[PDB]
């Protein structure tokens, strides 16, 4: 079930990557996607090789939606308190420590998480506060 | 070997089809017996309703 | 359609017989379905899980159906396999793997000093008289305990059993070497002699186990 | 595919929980009906539900007069279902009894009906004690009445001929 659903968004994609058209030939003209607006537009004509436009059908399977490729659901954790909920999940969820949370704060969360048995992103990021290879 | 292949369901639901179960036991009918084998004769014999 | 008509024509018929043997014993299999079974400590959680039992039993049966059948199309025994040619007697190998048909892995033991193993598109294999229930799958390459010698003495007994048939049968001995040379392979003639097995198969079954798990391999 | 089937995508979609019901107490009432409706005999409560979602063009004042001639003892003082509200506008010495059920009443209408007979009931107490919703009269509109159909714009709007 889940394994197959995770694989159906992640190994297929869709990675066309929807870049704004001809973003490359002016630098300033930004990468962020804009709908090809005007009639002649080849992309607008919704041709193949023209890079697909965004539409609802493009969408991922719900069962696979907002998951990390690991297939854990990420939960943003500001502090220790969020940890309780995360601990309940444990298997289901991975915890991601917000960038803001400070180095002095980060330590308590990390140890608590382990005890919680919710090792995920947080470990990586704590070795990332230490230094390191 | 077209009713078997390509038949589909009625209103009071959606369509779920003319597959095994759901023509013997399901399908409406007030005229006669609605079931597959019986219906194919009744339609091409062209009688009452 | 010709196999598939036979299944219909109760429905069940043996499965209408099956109930009966329980009905005959006496009065039963509603009570035993409801009253049973186990439970109650445990730790944690939903207990969403699982297996053994009832589905697994059709999946093994179901998996058994290509298995004769692919041999009826291609003819032979199964594994375990002998060098016909090469050395007059000599030794025994098991088809653990197909890279393909033709590219095959033929096997053995090695735990102290060891023994090779080959992947070949050929060199030297014609089959014997044993069947299992795999086709031609197991592997990486494992075995070991007595078994350079045992597998091998198992070889000698088959090589004697074969060598006599190679005398009676062949066109002669020199292209039994071309047949052994081939090793895709296959269809033409298969079943000569070498009677019976009961040991040969027991030996083959161990060989399959040995090229499986759990020895020498774990850290 | 067909063009028929595209037109089939173009039916309605009437469907609406209204944009807000700021009253929480109405907001819970309007949901209750889809659980209760397919779970009892009550067609009426299922009708009240649409008419307490959608519109103000739909929400009824009913006067005590507009109950009063219209209930008149020949469906013998049943339960009168007023989707929106009662209003206070009559004097006769009003109703012959009566169990009246509505979202809202004015206080004068509340006072005058209960001192004539019966009870001014709230729709939820109605759902509790009349869950079947039978022996009940859906009485009634309006916004459909004389003032204002298309009679809008300035000085209007008219029989019509022109406007």
């Amino acid at each position: 079930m889940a394994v197959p659903l995770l694989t159906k968004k992640i190994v297929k994609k869709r990675v066309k990557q929807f870049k704004r058209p001809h973003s490359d030939r002016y630098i300033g003209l930004k990468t962020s996607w804009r709908r090809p607006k005007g009639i002649d537009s080849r992309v607008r004509r919704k041709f193949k090789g023209c890079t697909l436009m965004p539409n609802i059908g493009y969408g991922s399977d719900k069962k696979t939606r907002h998951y990390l490729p690991n297939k854990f659901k990420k939960f943003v954790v500001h502090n220790v308190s969020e940890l309780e909920l995360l601990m309940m999940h444990n298997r289901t969820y991975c915890a991601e420590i917000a960038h803001n949370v400070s180095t002095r704060k980060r330590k308590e969360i990390v140890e608590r998480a382990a005890q919680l048995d919710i090792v995920v992103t947080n470990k990586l990021a704590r070795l990332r506060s230490q230094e390191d290879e | 070997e077209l009713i078997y292949k390509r038949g589909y369901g009625k209103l009071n639901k959606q369509r779920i089809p003319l597959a095994n179960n759901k023509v013997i036991e399901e399908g409406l009918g007030k005229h006669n017996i609605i079931c597959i084998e019986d219906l194919v004769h009744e339609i091409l014999t062209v009688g009452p309703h | 359609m010709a196999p598939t008509s036979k299944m219909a024509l109760g429905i069940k018929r043996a499965s209408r017989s099956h109930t009966y043997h329980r009905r005959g014993l006496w009065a039963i299999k509603a009570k035993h379905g409801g009253a049973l079974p186990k439970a109650e400590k445990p730790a944690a959680i939903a207990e969403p899980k699982f297996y053994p039992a009832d589905d697994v039993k059709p999946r093994t049966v179901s998996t058994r159906k290509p298995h004769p059948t692919k041999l009826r199309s291609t003819i032979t025994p199964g594994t375990v396999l002998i060098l016909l040619a090469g050395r007059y007697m000599g030794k025994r190998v098991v088809f653990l793997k197909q890279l393909q048909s033709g590219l095959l892995l033929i096997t053995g033991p090695f735990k102290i000093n060891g023994v090779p193993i080959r992947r070949v598109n050929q060199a030297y294999v014609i089959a014997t008289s044993t069947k299992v229930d795999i086709s031609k799958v197991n592997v990486q390459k494992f075995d070991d305990k007595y078994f350079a010698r045992e597998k091998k003495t198992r070889a000698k007994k088959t090589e004697g059993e074969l060598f006599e048939s190679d005398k009676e049968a062949t066109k002669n001995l020199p292209d039994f070497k071309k047949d052994d040379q081939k090793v895709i392979d296959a269809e033409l003639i298969k079943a000569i002699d070498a009677v019976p097995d009961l040991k040969n198969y027991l030996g083959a079954r161990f060989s399959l186990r040995d090229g499986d798990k759990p020895h020498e391999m774990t850290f | 595919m067909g063009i028929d089937l595209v037109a089939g995508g173009r039916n309605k979609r009437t469907k609406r929980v209204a944009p807000k019901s700021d009253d929480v107490y109405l907001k819970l009432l309007v949901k209750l009906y889809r659980f209760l409706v397919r779970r009892t005999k009550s067609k009426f409560n299922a009708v009240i539900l649409k008419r307490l979602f959608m519109s103000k063009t739909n929400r009824p004042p009913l006067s005590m007069r507009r109950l009063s001639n219209f209930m008149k003892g020949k469906e013998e003082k049943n339960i009168a279902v007023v989707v929106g509200t009662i209003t206070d506008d009559m004097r006769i010495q009003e109703v012959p009894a009566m169990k009246v059920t509505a979202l809202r009443f004015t206080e004068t209408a509340r006072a005058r009906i209960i001192n004539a007979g019966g009870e001014c009931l709230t729709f939820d107490q109605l759902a509790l004690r009349a869950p079947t919703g039978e022996n009940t009269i859906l009485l009634r509109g309006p916004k459909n009445a004389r003032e204002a159909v298309r009679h809008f714009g300035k000085a209007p709007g008219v029989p019509h001929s022109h406007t």
Binding site: - | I43, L44, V46 | - | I3
Partner: protein
């Protein structure tokens, strides 16, 4: 369907031979056919009224 044809052999005897070997076709009697239909739409909705 065999009996519908079948009276047409059983009474008749003018139908096969003369008929292979000569032209015009016969007097007497004829047996009728029925028959219901199926319709599948081969051509799309582009450029027709």
């Amino acid at each position: 369907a065999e009996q519908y044809a079948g009276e047409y052999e059983a009474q008749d005897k003018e139908l096969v031979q003369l008929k292979r070997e000569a032209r015009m076709k016969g007097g007497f009697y004829v047996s009728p056919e029925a028959k219901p239909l199926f319709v599948v739409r081969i051509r799309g909705i582009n450029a027709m009224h």
